[PDB]
Amino acid sequence: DLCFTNVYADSFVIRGDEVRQIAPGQTGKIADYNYKLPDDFTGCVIAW
Amino acid sequence: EVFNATRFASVYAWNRKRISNCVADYSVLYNSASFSTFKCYGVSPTKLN
Ligand SMILES: CCCCC/C=C\C/C=C\CCCCCCCC(=O)O
């Protein structure tokens, strides 16, 4: 029921036990040196 | 000796250890360890350093 303004799509492959690291505060090998999300994120995370 | 031991206790006789006089640089675990569940309760994990 909405319309979206500035849409971007990221994409990568990791290992299962690291999916929990894709979030605002996670401080791990993936969130520290590889990929980090803001603390005021607006969007959706999707894994499979 | 903790995460890389040889035998762990039985949950009915769980073990308990004491840690003192050491440096907590957990970044040594990134190379070999892989945790599926990690949750801190009374502290934010971005301030464990
Ligand atoms: C030997 C125990 C020393 C205890 C020191 C006190 C607090 C330290 C808190 C957490 C240390 C382990 C965090 C797990 C490492 C991040 C997850 C990962 O590996 O990616």
Coordinates of all heavy atoms in Angstrom, one line a residue:
Chain A
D1 N 0.8 -1.2 0.0 CA 0.0 0.0 0.0 C 0.8 1.3 0.0 O 0.3 2.3 0.4 CB -0.9 0.0 1.2 CG -1.8 -1.2 1.3 OD1 -2.5 -1.5 0.3 OD2 -1.8 -1.9 2.3
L2 N 2.1 1.2 -0.4 CA 3.0 2.3 -0.3 C 3.7 2.5 -1.7 O 3.5 1.8 -2.6 CB 4.1 2.0 0.8 CG 3.6 2.1 2.2 CD1 4.5 1.2 3.1 CD2 3.5 3.5 2.7
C3 N 4.6 3.6 -1.7 CA 5.5 3.9 -2.8 C 6.8 4.3 -2.2 O 6.9 5.0 -1.2 CB 4.9 5.0 -3.7 SG 3.4 4.5 -4.6
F4 N 7.9 3.8 -2.8 CA 9.2 3.9 -2.3 C 10.1 4.8 -3.1 O 10.0 4.9 -4.3 CB 9.8 2.5 -2.2 CG 8.9 1.4 -1.8 CD1 8.1 0.7 -2.8 CD2 8.7 1.1 -0.5 CE1 7.2 -0.2 -2.4 CE2 7.8 0.1 -0.1 CZ 7.1 -0.5 -1.1
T5 N 11.0 5.5 -2.4 CA 11.7 6.7 -2.9 C 13.0 6.4 -3.6 O 13.2 6.5 -4.8 CB 11.9 7.8 -1.9 OG1 10.6 8.1 -1.3 CG2 12.5 9.0 -2.4
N6 N 14.0 5.9 -2.7 CA 15.4 5.7 -3.2 C 15.8 4.2 -2.9 O 16.3 3.9 -1.8 CB 16.3 6.7 -2.5 CG 17.3 7.3 -3.4 OD1 16.9 7.7 -4.6 ND2 18.5 7.6 -2.9
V7 N 15.5 3.4 -3.8 CA 15.6 1.9 -3.6 C 17.0 1.4 -4.1 O 17.3 1.7 -5.3 CB 14.5 1.2 -4.3 CG1 14.5 -0.3 -4.1 CG2 13.1 1.8 -3.9
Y8 N 17.7 0.8 -3.3 CA 19.0 0.1 -3.7 C 18.9 -1.3 -3.2 O 18.3 -1.6 -2.1 CB 20.2 0.8 -3.1 CG 20.5 2.1 -3.8 CD1 20.3 3.4 -3.2 CD2 21.0 2.1 -5.1 CE1 20.6 4.5 -3.8 CE2 21.3 3.3 -5.7 CZ 21.1 4.5 -5.1 OH 21.4 5.7 -5.7
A9 N 19.6 -2.2 -3.9 CA 19.6 -3.6 -3.6 C 21.1 -4.1 -3.5 O 21.8 -4.0 -4.5 CB 18.9 -4.4 -4.6
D10 N 21.5 -4.6 -2.3 CA 22.8 -5.2 -2.1 C 22.6 -6.7 -2.3 O 21.5 -7.2 -2.4 CB 23.3 -4.9 -0.7 CG 23.2 -3.4 -0.3 OD1 22.6 -2.7 -1.1 OD2 23.7 -3.0 0.7
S11 N 23.8 -7.4 -2.4 CA 23.8 -8.8 -2.7 C 25.2 -9.4 -2.4 O 26.2 -8.9 -2.9 CB 23.5 -9.0 -4.2 OG 22.5 -8.1 -4.7
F12 N 25.2 -10.5 -1.7 CA 26.4 -11.2 -1.4 C 26.1 -12.6 -0.9 O 24.9 -12.9 -0.6 CB 27.3 -10.4 -0.4 CG 26.6 -9.8 0.7 CD1 26.5 -10.5 1.9 CD2 26.1 -8.5 0.6 CE1 25.9 -9.9 3.0 CE2 25.5 -8.0 1.7 CZ 25.3 -8.6 2.9
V13 N 27.2 -13.4 -0.7 CA 27.1 -14.7 -0.2 C 28.0 -14.9 1.0 O 29.1 -14.5 1.0 CB 27.5 -15.7 -1.3 CG1 27.6 -17.1 -0.8 CG2 26.6 -15.7 -2.5
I14 N 27.5 -15.5 2.0 CA 28.2 -15.7 3.3 C 27.9 -17.1 3.7 O 27.2 -17.9 3.0 CB 27.9 -14.7 4.4 CG1 26.5 -14.8 4.9 CG2 28.2 -13.3 3.8 CD1 26.1 -13.7 5.9
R15 N 28.4 -17.5 4.9 CA 28.0 -18.8 5.5 C 26.9 -18.6 6.5 O 26.7 -17.6 7.1 CB 29.3 -19.4 6.2 CG 29.8 -18.6 7.4 CD 30.6 -19.5 8.3 NE 31.4 -20.5 7.6 CZ 32.7 -20.5 7.6 NH1 33.4 -19.7 8.4 NH2 33.4 -21.4 6.9
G16 N 26.1 -19.7 6.7 CA 24.9 -19.7 7.4 C 25.1 -19.0 8.8 O 24.3 -18.1 9.2
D17 N 26.0 -19.5 9.6 CA 26.2 -19.0 10.9 C 26.6 -17.6 11.0 O 26.9 -17.1 12.2 CB 27.2 -19.9 11.7 CG 26.6 -21.3 11.9 OD1 25.5 -21.6 11.6 OD2 27.4 -22.1 12.5
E18 N 26.7 -16.9 9.9 CA 27.0 -15.5 9.9 C 25.8 -14.6 9.5 O 25.9 -13.4 9.6 CB 28.2 -15.2 9.0 CG 29.5 -15.7 9.5 CD 30.6 -15.4 8.5 OE1 30.3 -14.9 7.4 OE2 31.8 -15.7 8.8
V19 N 24.7 -15.2 9.2 CA 23.5 -14.4 8.8 C 23.1 -13.5 10.0 O 22.6 -12.4 9.8 CB 22.4 -15.3 8.3 CG1 21.1 -14.5 8.1 CG2 22.8 -15.9 7.0
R20 N 23.2 -14.0 11.2 CA 22.8 -13.2 12.4 C 23.7 -12.0 12.5 O 23.3 -11.1 13.2 CB 22.9 -14.1 13.6 CG 24.2 -14.8 13.7 CD 24.5 -15.3 15.2 NE 25.9 -15.4 15.4 CZ 26.7 -14.5 16.0 NH1 26.1 -13.4 16.5 NH2 28.0 -14.8 16.2
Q21 N 24.8 -11.9 11.8 CA 25.6 -10.7 11.8 C 25.2 -9.6 10.9 O 25.7 -8.5 11.0 CB 27.1 -11.1 11.5 CG 27.9 -11.7 12.6 CD 29.3 -11.9 12.2 OE1 30.0 -11.0 11.6 NE2 29.9 -13.0 12.5
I22 N 24.2 -9.9 10.0 CA 23.7 -8.9 9.1 C 22.6 -8.1 9.9 O 21.4 -8.4 9.7 CB 23.2 -9.5 7.8 CG1 24.3 -10.4 7.2 CG2 22.9 -8.4 6.8 CD1 25.6 -9.8 6.9
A23 N 23.0 -7.2 10.7 CA 22.0 -6.4 11.5 C 22.7 -5.2 12.1 O 24.0 -5.1 12.0 CB 21.4 -7.3 12.6
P24 N 22.0 -4.2 12.6 CA 22.7 -3.0 13.1 C 23.9 -3.2 14.0 O 25.0 -2.7 13.6 CB 21.5 -2.3 13.8 CG 20.3 -2.7 13.0 CD 20.6 -4.1 12.6
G25 N 23.7 -3.8 15.1 CA 24.8 -4.1 16.0 C 25.1 -5.5 16.2 O 24.4 -6.3 16.9
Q26 N 26.2 -6.0 15.6 CA 26.6 -7.4 15.7 C 28.1 -7.7 16.0 O 28.4 -8.8 16.5 CB 26.2 -8.2 14.5 CG 24.7 -8.4 14.4 CD 24.1 -9.2 15.6 OE1 24.6 -10.3 15.9 NE2 23.2 -8.6 16.3
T27 N 29.0 -6.7 15.6 CA 30.4 -6.8 16.1 C 31.0 -8.2 15.9 O 31.4 -8.8 16.8 CB 30.6 -6.3 17.5 OG1 31.9 -6.4 17.9 CG2 29.7 -7.1 18.5
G28 N 31.1 -8.6 14.6 CA 31.8 -9.8 14.3 C 32.7 -9.7 13.2 O 33.1 -8.5 12.8
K29 N 33.2 -10.8 12.6 CA 34.1 -10.7 11.4 C 33.5 -10.1 10.2 O 34.1 -9.4 9.4 CB 34.6 -12.1 11.1 CG 35.7 -12.2 10.0 CD 36.4 -13.5 10.0 CE 35.4 -14.7 10.0 NZ 34.4 -14.6 8.9
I30 N 32.1 -10.2 10.1 CA 31.5 -9.7 8.9 C 31.0 -8.3 9.1 O 31.0 -7.5 8.2 CB 30.3 -10.6 8.5 CG1 30.7 -12.0 8.1 CG2 29.4 -9.9 7.4 CD1 31.4 -12.0 6.8
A31 N 30.6 -7.9 10.3 CA 30.2 -6.6 10.6 C 31.3 -5.6 10.9 O 31.0 -4.4 10.9 CB 29.2 -6.6 11.9
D32 N 32.5 -6.0 11.1 CA 33.6 -5.2 11.5 C 34.5 -4.9 10.3 O 35.0 -3.7 10.2 CB 34.5 -5.9 12.6 CG 33.8 -5.8 14.0 OD1 32.8 -5.0 14.1 OD2 34.3 -6.4 14.9
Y33 N 34.8 -5.8 9.4 CA 35.8 -5.7 8.4 C 35.2 -5.8 7.0 O 35.8 -5.5 6.0 CB 36.9 -6.7 8.5 CG 37.5 -6.8 9.9 CD1 38.1 -8.0 10.3 CD2 37.5 -5.7 10.8 CE1 38.7 -8.1 11.6 CE2 38.1 -5.8 12.0 CZ 38.6 -7.0 12.4 OH 39.2 -7.1 13.7
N34 N 33.9 -6.3 6.9 CA 33.4 -6.7 5.6 C 32.1 -5.9 5.2 O 32.0 -5.5 4.0 CB 33.1 -8.2 5.6 CG 34.3 -9.0 5.6 OD1 34.9 -9.3 4.5 ND2 34.8 -9.4 6.8
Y35 N 31.2 -5.7 6.1 CA 29.9 -5.1 5.7 C 29.2 -4.7 7.0 O 28.9 -5.6 7.8 CB 29.1 -6.1 4.9 CG 27.7 -5.5 4.4 CD1 27.6 -4.9 3.2 CD2 26.6 -5.5 5.2 CE1 26.5 -4.4 2.7 CE2 25.4 -5.0 4.8 CZ 25.3 -4.4 3.5 OH 24.2 -3.9 3.1
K36 N 28.8 -3.4 7.1 CA 28.1 -2.9 8.3 C 26.8 -2.1 7.8 O 26.8 -1.5 6.8 CB 29.0 -2.0 9.1 CG 28.4 -1.6 10.4 CD 29.3 -0.6 11.1 CE 28.5 0.0 12.2 NZ 28.5 -0.8 13.4
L37 N 25.8 -2.2 8.7 CA 24.5 -1.6 8.5 C 24.4 -0.4 9.4 O 24.9 -0.5 10.6 CB 23.4 -2.5 8.7 CG 23.0 -3.5 7.5 CD1 21.9 -4.4 7.9 CD2 22.6 -2.7 6.3
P38 N 23.8 0.7 9.0 CA 23.6 1.9 9.9 C 22.8 1.5 11.2 O 22.2 0.4 11.3 CB 22.8 2.9 9.0 CG 23.2 2.5 7.7 CD 23.3 1.0 7.7
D39 N 22.8 2.4 12.1 CA 22.0 2.2 13.4 C 20.6 2.8 13.3 O 19.8 2.6 14.2 CB 22.8 2.9 14.5 CG 24.2 2.4 14.7 OD1 24.4 1.2 14.4 OD2 25.1 3.2 15.1
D40 N 20.2 3.4 12.2 CA 18.9 3.9 11.9 C 18.4 3.4 10.6 O 17.8 4.1 9.8 CB 18.8 5.4 12.0 CG 19.1 6.0 13.4 OD1 18.4 5.5 14.3 OD2 20.0 6.9 13.5
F41 N 18.6 2.1 10.4 CA 18.2 1.5 9.1 C 16.7 1.5 8.8 O 15.9 1.4 9.8 CB 18.7 0.0 9.1 CG 18.7 -0.6 7.7 CD1 19.2 0.0 6.6 CD2 18.2 -1.9 7.5 CE1 19.2 -0.5 5.4 CE2 18.2 -2.5 6.3 CZ 18.7 -1.8 5.2
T42 N 16.4 1.6 7.6 CA 15.0 1.5 7.1 C 15.0 0.7 5.9 O 15.6 1.1 4.8 CB 14.3 2.9 6.9 OG1 14.3 3.6 8.1 CG2 12.9 2.7 6.3
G43 N 14.5 -0.5 5.9 CA 14.6 -1.5 4.8 C 14.3 -2.9 5.3 O 13.6 -3.1 6.4
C44 N 14.7 -3.9 4.6 CA 14.4 -5.3 4.8 C 15.6 -6.1 4.5 O 16.3 -5.9 3.5 CB 13.2 -5.7 4.1 SG 11.7 -4.7 4.4
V45 N 15.9 -7.1 5.3 CA 16.9 -8.1 5.1 C 16.3 -9.4 4.7 O 15.2 -9.8 5.3 CB 17.8 -8.3 6.4 CG1 19.0 -9.2 6.1 CG2 18.4 -7.0 6.8
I46 N 16.9 -10.1 3.8 CA 16.4 -11.3 3.2 C 17.5 -12.3 2.9 O 18.5 -11.9 2.3 CB 15.7 -11.0 1.8 CG1 14.4 -10.2 2.1 CG2 15.4 -12.2 1.0 CD1 14.1 -9.1 1.0
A47 N 17.4 -13.5 3.4 CA 18.4 -14.5 3.2 C 17.8 -15.8 2.8 O 16.6 -16.1 3.0 CB 19.2 -14.7 4.5
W48 N 18.7 -16.7 2.2 CA 18.2 -18.0 1.8 C 19.4 -18.9 1.4 O 20.3 -18.4 0.8 CB 17.1 -18.0 0.7 CG 17.7 -17.6 -0.6 CD1 18.1 -18.5 -1.6 CD2 17.8 -16.3 -1.2 NE1 18.4 -17.8 -2.7 CE2 18.3 -16.4 -2.5 CE3 17.5 -15.0 -0.7 CZ2 18.6 -15.3 -3.3 CZ3 17.8 -13.9 -1.5 CH2 18.3 -14.1 -2.8
Chain B
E1 N 41.9 -23.2 26.2 CA 41.5 -24.3 27.2 C 40.0 -24.3 27.4 O 39.5 -25.3 27.9 CB 42.3 -24.0 28.5 CG 43.8 -24.3 28.5 CD 44.5 -23.1 27.9 OE1 44.9 -22.2 28.7 OE2 44.8 -23.1 26.7
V2 N 39.3 -23.2 27.1 CA 37.9 -23.1 27.3 C 37.1 -23.5 26.1 O 36.4 -24.5 26.1 CB 37.5 -21.7 27.8 CG1 36.0 -21.5 27.7 CG2 38.0 -21.4 29.2
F3 N 37.3 -22.8 25.0 CA 36.6 -23.1 23.8 C 37.2 -24.3 23.0 O 36.5 -24.9 22.1 CB 36.5 -21.8 22.9 CG 35.8 -20.7 23.5 CD1 36.3 -19.9 24.5 CD2 34.5 -20.4 23.1 CE1 35.6 -18.9 25.0 CE2 33.8 -19.4 23.6 CZ 34.3 -18.6 24.6
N4 N 38.5 -24.5 23.2 CA 39.2 -25.5 22.4 C 39.7 -26.6 23.4 O 40.9 -27.0 23.4 CB 40.4 -25.0 21.7 CG 40.7 -25.7 20.4 OD1 39.9 -26.4 19.9 ND2 41.9 -25.4 19.8
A5 N 38.8 -27.2 24.2 CA 39.1 -28.3 25.1 C 38.9 -29.6 24.4 O 38.7 -29.7 23.2 CB 38.3 -28.2 26.4
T6 N 39.0 -30.7 25.2 CA 38.9 -32.0 24.7 C 37.6 -32.7 25.2 O 37.0 -33.5 24.4 CB 40.1 -32.9 25.1 OG1 39.9 -34.2 24.6 CG2 40.3 -32.9 26.6
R7 N 37.1 -32.4 26.4 CA 35.9 -33.0 26.9 C 35.2 -31.9 27.7 O 35.8 -31.2 28.5 CB 36.1 -34.2 27.8 CG 35.7 -35.5 27.2 CD 35.5 -36.6 28.3 NE 34.2 -36.3 29.0 CZ 33.0 -36.7 28.6 NH1 32.9 -37.3 27.5 NH2 31.9 -36.4 29.4
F8 N 33.9 -31.8 27.4 CA 33.0 -30.8 28.2 C 32.2 -31.6 29.2 O 32.1 -32.8 29.1 CB 32.1 -30.1 27.2 CG 32.7 -28.7 26.8 CD1 33.9 -28.6 26.3 CD2 31.9 -27.6 27.0 CE1 34.4 -27.4 25.9 CE2 32.4 -26.4 26.6 CZ 33.7 -26.3 26.1
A9 N 31.7 -30.9 30.2 CA 31.0 -31.5 31.3 C 29.6 -32.0 30.9 O 29.2 -31.8 29.7 CB 30.9 -30.6 32.5
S10 N 28.9 -32.7 31.8 CA 27.5 -33.1 31.6 C 26.6 -32.1 32.2 O 26.9 -31.6 33.3 CB 27.3 -34.5 32.1 OG 28.2 -35.4 31.7
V11 N 25.5 -31.7 31.5 CA 24.7 -30.5 31.9 C 24.2 -30.7 33.4 O 23.9 -29.7 34.0 CB 23.6 -30.4 30.9 CG1 22.8 -31.7 30.7 CG2 22.6 -29.3 31.5
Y12 N 24.1 -31.9 33.9 CA 23.8 -32.1 35.3 C 24.9 -31.8 36.2 O 24.7 -31.6 37.4 CB 23.2 -33.5 35.5 CG 24.1 -34.5 36.0 CD1 24.2 -34.7 37.4 CD2 24.9 -35.4 35.2 CE1 25.1 -35.6 37.9 CE2 25.7 -36.3 35.7 CZ 25.8 -36.4 37.1 OH 26.7 -37.4 37.6
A13 N 26.1 -31.9 35.7 CA 27.3 -31.6 36.5 C 28.2 -30.5 35.7 O 29.4 -30.6 35.6 CB 28.2 -32.8 36.7
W14 N 27.5 -29.5 35.2 CA 28.1 -28.5 34.4 C 29.3 -27.9 35.2 O 29.3 -27.9 36.4 CB 27.2 -27.3 34.1 CG 26.3 -26.9 35.3 CD1 25.2 -27.4 35.8 CD2 26.6 -25.8 36.2 NE1 24.7 -26.7 36.8 CE2 25.6 -25.7 37.1 CE3 27.7 -24.8 36.2 CZ2 25.6 -24.7 38.1 CZ3 27.6 -23.9 37.2 CH2 26.6 -23.8 38.1
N15 N 30.4 -27.5 34.4 CA 31.6 -27.0 35.1 C 31.5 -25.5 35.3 O 30.5 -24.8 34.9 CB 32.8 -27.3 34.2 CG 34.0 -27.7 34.9 OD1 34.0 -28.5 35.9 ND2 35.2 -27.1 34.5
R16 N 32.4 -25.0 36.1 CA 32.5 -23.6 36.4 C 33.9 -23.2 36.6 O 34.6 -23.9 37.4 CB 31.6 -23.2 37.7 CG 31.6 -21.7 38.0 CD 30.8 -21.5 39.3 NE 30.2 -20.1 39.4 CZ 29.2 -19.7 38.7 NH1 28.7 -20.5 37.7 NH2 28.7 -18.5 38.8
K17 N 34.4 -22.2 35.9 CA 35.8 -21.7 35.9 C 35.8 -20.3 36.4 O 34.8 -19.6 36.6 CB 36.4 -21.9 34.5 CG 37.9 -21.8 34.5 CD 38.3 -22.0 33.0 CE 39.8 -21.6 32.9 NZ 40.7 -22.4 33.8
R18 N 37.1 -19.8 36.7 CA 37.3 -18.5 37.2 C 38.4 -17.9 36.3 O 39.4 -18.5 36.0 CB 37.8 -18.5 38.6 CG 38.4 -17.3 39.2 CD 37.3 -16.2 39.5 NE 37.9 -15.0 40.1 CZ 37.2 -14.0 40.6 NH1 35.9 -14.1 40.7 NH2 37.8 -13.0 41.1
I19 N 38.2 -16.6 35.9 CA 39.1 -15.9 35.0 C 39.5 -14.6 35.6 O 38.7 -13.8 36.0 CB 38.5 -15.7 33.6 CG1 37.8 -17.0 33.1 CG2 39.6 -15.4 32.6 CD1 37.5 -17.1 31.7
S20 N 40.8 -14.4 35.7 CA 41.4 -13.2 36.3 C 42.7 -12.9 35.7 O 43.5 -13.8 35.3 CB 41.4 -13.3 37.8 OG 42.1 -14.4 38.2
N21 N 43.1 -11.6 35.7 CA 44.5 -11.2 35.2 C 44.7 -11.7 33.8 O 45.6 -12.5 33.5 CB 45.5 -11.7 36.2 CG 45.4 -11.1 37.6 OD1 45.5 -9.9 37.7 ND2 45.2 -12.0 38.6
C22 N 44.0 -11.2 32.8 CA 44.1 -11.5 31.4 C 43.5 -10.4 30.6 O 42.8 -9.5 31.0 CB 43.5 -12.9 31.1 SG 41.7 -12.9 31.0
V23 N 43.8 -10.5 29.3 CA 43.4 -9.5 28.3 C 42.4 -10.2 27.4 O 42.6 -11.3 26.8 CB 44.6 -9.0 27.5 CG1 44.2 -8.2 26.3 CG2 45.6 -8.3 28.3
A24 N 41.2 -9.5 27.2 CA 40.1 -10.0 26.5 C 40.1 -9.5 25.0 O 39.3 -8.6 24.6 CB 38.8 -9.7 27.2
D25 N 41.0 -10.1 24.2 CA 41.1 -9.8 22.8 C 40.5 -11.0 22.1 O 41.2 -11.9 21.6 CB 42.5 -9.5 22.3 CG 42.6 -9.1 20.9 OD1 42.5 -7.9 20.6 OD2 42.8 -10.0 20.0
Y26 N 39.1 -11.0 22.0 CA 38.4 -12.1 21.4 C 38.6 -12.3 19.9 O 38.2 -13.3 19.3 CB 37.0 -12.1 21.7 CG 36.3 -10.8 21.5 CD1 35.6 -10.5 20.3 CD2 36.2 -9.8 22.5 CE1 35.0 -9.3 20.0 CE2 35.6 -8.6 22.3 CZ 35.0 -8.3 21.0 OH 34.4 -7.1 20.8
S27 N 39.3 -11.3 19.2 CA 39.5 -11.3 17.8 C 40.4 -12.5 17.4 O 40.6 -12.7 16.2 CB 40.1 -10.0 17.3 OG 39.4 -8.9 17.9
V28 N 41.0 -13.2 18.3 CA 41.7 -14.4 18.0 C 40.8 -15.6 17.6 O 41.3 -16.5 16.9 CB 42.6 -14.9 19.2 CG1 43.7 -15.8 18.6 CG2 43.2 -13.7 19.9
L29 N 39.5 -15.5 18.0 CA 38.6 -16.6 17.6 C 38.1 -16.5 16.2 O 37.6 -17.5 15.7 CB 37.4 -16.5 18.6 CG 37.8 -16.7 20.1 CD1 36.6 -16.4 20.9 CD2 38.2 -18.2 20.3
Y30 N 38.2 -15.3 15.5 CA 37.7 -15.1 14.2 C 38.3 -16.1 13.2 O 37.6 -16.5 12.2 CB 38.0 -13.7 13.7 CG 37.2 -12.6 14.5 CD1 37.5 -11.3 14.2 CD2 36.3 -12.9 15.4 CE1 36.8 -10.3 14.9 CE2 35.6 -11.9 16.1 CZ 35.9 -10.6 15.8 OH 35.2 -9.6 16.5
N31 N 39.5 -16.6 13.4 CA 40.2 -17.4 12.4 C 39.7 -18.9 12.4 O 39.7 -19.5 11.3 CB 41.7 -17.4 12.7 CG 42.5 -17.7 11.4 OD1 42.0 -18.3 10.5 ND2 43.7 -17.3 11.4
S32 N 39.3 -19.4 13.5 CA 39.0 -20.8 13.7 C 37.6 -21.1 14.1 O 36.9 -22.0 13.7 CB 40.0 -21.5 14.6 OG 40.0 -20.8 15.9
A33 N 37.1 -20.3 15.1 CA 35.8 -20.5 15.7 C 34.7 -20.1 14.7 O 34.8 -19.3 13.8 CB 35.7 -19.7 17.0
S34 N 33.5 -20.7 15.0 CA 32.3 -20.3 14.2 C 31.1 -20.6 15.1 O 30.7 -21.7 15.3 CB 32.2 -21.1 12.9 OG 30.8 -21.1 12.4
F35 N 30.5 -19.5 15.7 CA 29.4 -19.7 16.6 C 28.1 -19.5 15.9 O 27.9 -18.7 15.0 CB 29.5 -18.6 17.7 CG 30.8 -18.6 18.5 CD1 31.2 -17.5 19.2 CD2 31.5 -19.8 18.6 CE1 32.4 -17.5 19.9 CE2 32.7 -19.8 19.3 CZ 33.1 -18.7 20.0
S36 N 27.1 -20.3 16.3 CA 25.8 -20.3 15.7 C 24.8 -19.4 16.6 O 23.9 -18.9 16.1 CB 25.2 -21.7 15.6 OG 24.5 -22.1 16.8
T37 N 25.1 -19.4 17.9 CA 24.3 -18.6 18.8 C 25.2 -17.8 19.8 O 26.1 -18.4 20.4 CB 23.4 -19.5 19.7 OG1 22.3 -20.0 18.9 CG2 22.8 -18.7 20.8
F38 N 25.0 -16.5 19.8 CA 25.8 -15.6 20.7 C 24.9 -14.4 21.1 O 24.4 -13.7 20.2 CB 27.0 -15.1 20.0 CG 27.7 -13.9 20.7 CD1 28.3 -14.1 21.9 CD2 27.6 -12.7 20.2 CE1 28.9 -13.1 22.5 CE2 28.2 -11.6 20.8 CZ 28.8 -11.8 22.0
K39 N 24.6 -14.3 22.4 CA 23.7 -13.3 22.8 C 24.1 -12.7 24.2 O 24.3 -13.5 25.1 CB 22.3 -13.9 23.0 CG 21.2 -13.0 23.7 CD 20.2 -12.5 22.7 CE 19.1 -11.7 23.5 NZ 19.6 -10.5 24.1
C40 N 24.3 -11.4 24.2 CA 24.7 -10.7 25.5 C 23.4 -10.0 25.9 O 22.7 -9.4 25.2 CB 25.8 -9.8 25.2 SG 27.4 -10.6 24.9
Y41 N 23.3 -9.9 27.3 CA 22.0 -9.5 27.9 C 22.1 -8.1 28.5 O 21.4 -7.2 28.2 CB 21.6 -10.5 28.9 CG 20.9 -11.7 28.3 CD1 21.6 -12.8 27.9 CD2 19.5 -11.7 28.1 CE1 21.0 -13.9 27.3 CE2 18.9 -12.8 27.5 CZ 19.7 -13.9 27.1 OH 19.1 -15.0 26.5
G42 N 23.0 -7.9 29.5 CA 23.1 -6.6 30.2 C 24.2 -5.7 29.6 O 24.5 -4.7 30.3
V43 N 24.6 -5.9 28.4 CA 25.7 -5.1 27.8 C 25.5 -5.2 26.3 O 25.1 -6.2 25.7 CB 27.1 -5.6 28.2 CG1 27.2 -7.1 28.1 CG2 28.2 -5.0 27.4
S44 N 25.9 -4.1 25.6 CA 25.8 -4.1 24.1 C 27.1 -4.7 23.6 O 28.2 -4.4 24.1 CB 25.7 -2.7 23.6 OG 24.3 -2.3 23.7
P45 N 27.1 -5.6 22.6 CA 28.3 -6.3 22.2 C 29.3 -5.4 21.5 O 30.5 -5.8 21.3 CB 27.8 -7.4 21.3 CG 26.4 -6.9 20.8 CD 25.9 -6.1 21.9
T46 N 28.9 -4.2 21.0 CA 29.8 -3.3 20.4 C 30.7 -2.6 21.4 O 31.5 -1.7 20.9 CB 29.0 -2.3 19.5 OG1 27.9 -1.9 20.2 CG2 28.6 -2.9 18.2
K47 N 30.5 -2.8 22.7 CA 31.3 -2.1 23.7 C 32.0 -3.1 24.6 O 32.5 -2.8 25.7 CB 30.4 -1.2 24.5 CG 29.4 -0.5 23.8 CD 29.0 0.8 24.4 CE 29.7 2.0 23.7 NZ 29.2 3.3 24.2
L48 N 32.2 -4.4 24.1 CA 33.0 -5.3 24.8 C 34.5 -5.1 24.6 O 35.3 -5.8 25.2 CB 32.7 -6.8 24.3 CG 31.2 -7.2 24.5 CD1 31.0 -8.5 23.8 CD2 30.9 -7.3 26.0
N49 N 34.9 -4.0 23.9 CA 36.3 -3.7 23.7 C 36.7 -2.5 24.5 O 37.9 -2.2 24.5 CB 36.5 -3.4 22.2 CG 37.6 -4.3 21.6 OD1 37.7 -5.5 21.8 ND2 38.5 -3.6 20.8
Ligands
LIG1 C1 37.9 -16.4 28.2 C2 36.6 -15.6 28.5 C3 37.0 -14.1 28.8 C4 35.7 -13.4 29.2 C5 35.9 -11.9 29.0 C6 34.6 -11.1 29.2 C7 33.8 -10.8 28.2 C8 34.1 -11.1 26.8 C9 32.8 -11.2 26.0 C10 32.6 -11.9 24.9 C11 33.8 -12.7 24.3 C12 33.3 -13.7 23.2 C13 32.5 -12.9 22.1 C14 32.4 -13.8 20.9 C15 33.3 -13.3 19.7 C16 32.4 -12.7 18.7 C17 31.7 -13.7 17.8 C18 32.7 -14.3 16.8 O1 33.6 -15.1 17.1 O2 32.6 -13.9 15.6

